[PDB]
Amino acid sequence: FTKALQDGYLTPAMEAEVGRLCVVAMPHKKFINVMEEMVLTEVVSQVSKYQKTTEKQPDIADIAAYALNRLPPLYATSEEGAEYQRQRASEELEFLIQQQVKDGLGRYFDRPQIADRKPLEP
Amino acid sequence: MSIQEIFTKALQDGYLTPAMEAEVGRLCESGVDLDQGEYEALDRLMAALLAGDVVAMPHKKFINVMEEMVLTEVVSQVSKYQKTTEKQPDIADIAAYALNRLPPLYATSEEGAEYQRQRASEELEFLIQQQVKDGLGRYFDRPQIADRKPLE
Numbered sequence: 001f002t003k004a005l006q007d008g009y010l011t012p013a014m015e016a017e018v019g020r021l022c023v024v025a026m027p028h029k030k031f032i033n034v035m036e037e038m039v040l041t042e043v044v045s046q047v048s049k050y051q052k053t054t055e056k057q058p059d060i061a062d063i064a065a066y067a068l069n070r071l072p073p074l075y076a077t078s079e080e081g082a083e084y085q086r087q088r089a090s091e092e093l094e095f096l097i098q099q100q101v102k103d104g105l106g107r108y109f110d111r112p113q114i115a116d117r118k119p120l121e122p
Numbered sequence: 123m124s125i126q127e128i129f130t131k132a133l134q135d136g137y138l139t140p141a142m143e144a145e146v147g148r149l150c151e152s153g154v155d156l157d158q159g160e161y162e163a164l165d166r167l168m169a170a171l172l173a174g175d176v177v178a179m180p181h182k183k184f185i186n187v188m189e190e191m192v193l194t195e196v197v198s199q200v201s202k203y204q205k206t207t208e209k210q211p212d213i214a215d216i217a218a219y220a221l222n223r224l225p226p227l228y229a230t231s232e233e234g235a236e237y238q239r240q241r242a243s244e245e246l247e248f249l250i251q252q253q254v255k256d257g258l259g260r261y262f263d264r265p266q267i268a269d270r271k272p273l274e
């Protein structure tokens with residue numbers, strides 16, 4: 001508590017530590033990657049077919065993250081900025097987004113789980 | 123985009139898309155409801171979400187590790203300016219500028235998040251510093267862009 005009082009900002013290594021017990025604070029709410037929204041929409045649109053089968057729906061996080069690492073980041077902090085990032089993705093990146101979601105889906109099916117892997121909360 | 127319709131489709135298709143998550147988000151804003159069929163629909167969606175019959179978008183389950191690196195570098199760079207200036211710098215503005223000019227480092231595991239910090243440490247350290255500096259620079263140049271509503 002004393003350190004952030006002097007260094008003047010609540011820093012990510014000493015911000016997620018108030019997630020271990022569970023002066024400016026880090027703004028995570030105020031910015032987002034608009035590509036995340038576009039990719040999830042395309043992931044749901046592609047994995048829909050499998051929802052009428054018996055078991056094993058494909059993991060969306062795995063597919064979205066693969067794809068997000070192979071697309072341009074679209075980080076905005078305003079509603080206007082977000083609309084610009086949506087218009088760009090919808091008008092310029094539509095085929096890029098499909099291929100990567102499809103690559104991701106095919107990667108998931110090839111290895112649905114990966115050994116020695118603990119998933120991640122905040 | 124009636125909440126009855128949302129409940130309908132969500133249950134049928136077995137997801138809640140980002141468009142649907144947004145309409146349910148905005149719809150929770152202290153306004154009028156049917157208070158009965160709008161209210162009931164939201165409560166059924168709830169029960170279905172909790173059962174696992176509507177899967178919502180796993181937002182909490184993947185993260186761009188690069189946001190941690192960037193946020194830590196911005197604090198490092200803005201820290202020396204704290205006393206100099208009423209209105210501290212906009213951290214969000216600076217990090218978003220930089221994040222748009224850096225590789226994404228998304229992960230789903232703890233081990234993945236570790237490989238991505240490793241990559242950032244050993245290869246991207248200077249690149250990150252330079253993008254945060256350019257972001258910080260653009261902030262001091264133009265601390266307030268006109269005609270923006272912030273997100274929350």
Ligand SMILES: Nc1nc2c(ncn2[C@@H]2O[C@@H]3COP(=O)(O)O[C@H]4[C@@H](O)[C@H](n5cnc6c(=O)[nH]c(N)nc65)O[C@@H]4COP(=O)(O)O[C@H]3[C@H]2O)c(=O)[nH]1
Binds near residue numbers: 212
């Ligand atoms: N066609 C068009 N697109 C526009 C316009 N203004 C913004 N955009 C687009 O929207 C993205 C997000 O803008 P933002 O939400 O203001 O989000 C901005 C903002 O928070 C910050 N930033 C950038 N420049 C400045 C600046 O001069 N001052 C401050 N304070 N923040 C800035 O960095 C974020 C990312 O900026 P970018 O990577 O440039 O990415 C921008 C850019 O692609 C515009 O007038 N026309």
Ligand SMILES: Nc1nc2c(ncn2[C@@H]2O[C@@H]3COP(=O)(O)O[C@H]4[C@@H](O)[C@H](n5cnc6c(=O)[nH]c(N)nc65)O[C@@H]4COP(=O)(O)O[C@H]3[C@H]2O)c(=O)[nH]1
Binds near residue numbers: 065066113234
């Ligand atoms: N040097 C090194 N780096 C490693 C290793 N394993 C993972 N990484 C790195 O860690 C990142 C995050 O991996 P993740 O959290 O497993 O998160 C993964 C996971 O959610 C998913 N994914 C990728 N490949 C597969 C796969 O074959 N099956 C499944 N189910 N998901 C996958 O996509 C996410 C992003 O994958 P990438 O873009 O490749 O991003 C990977 C990659 O950059 C390793 O053995 N060595």
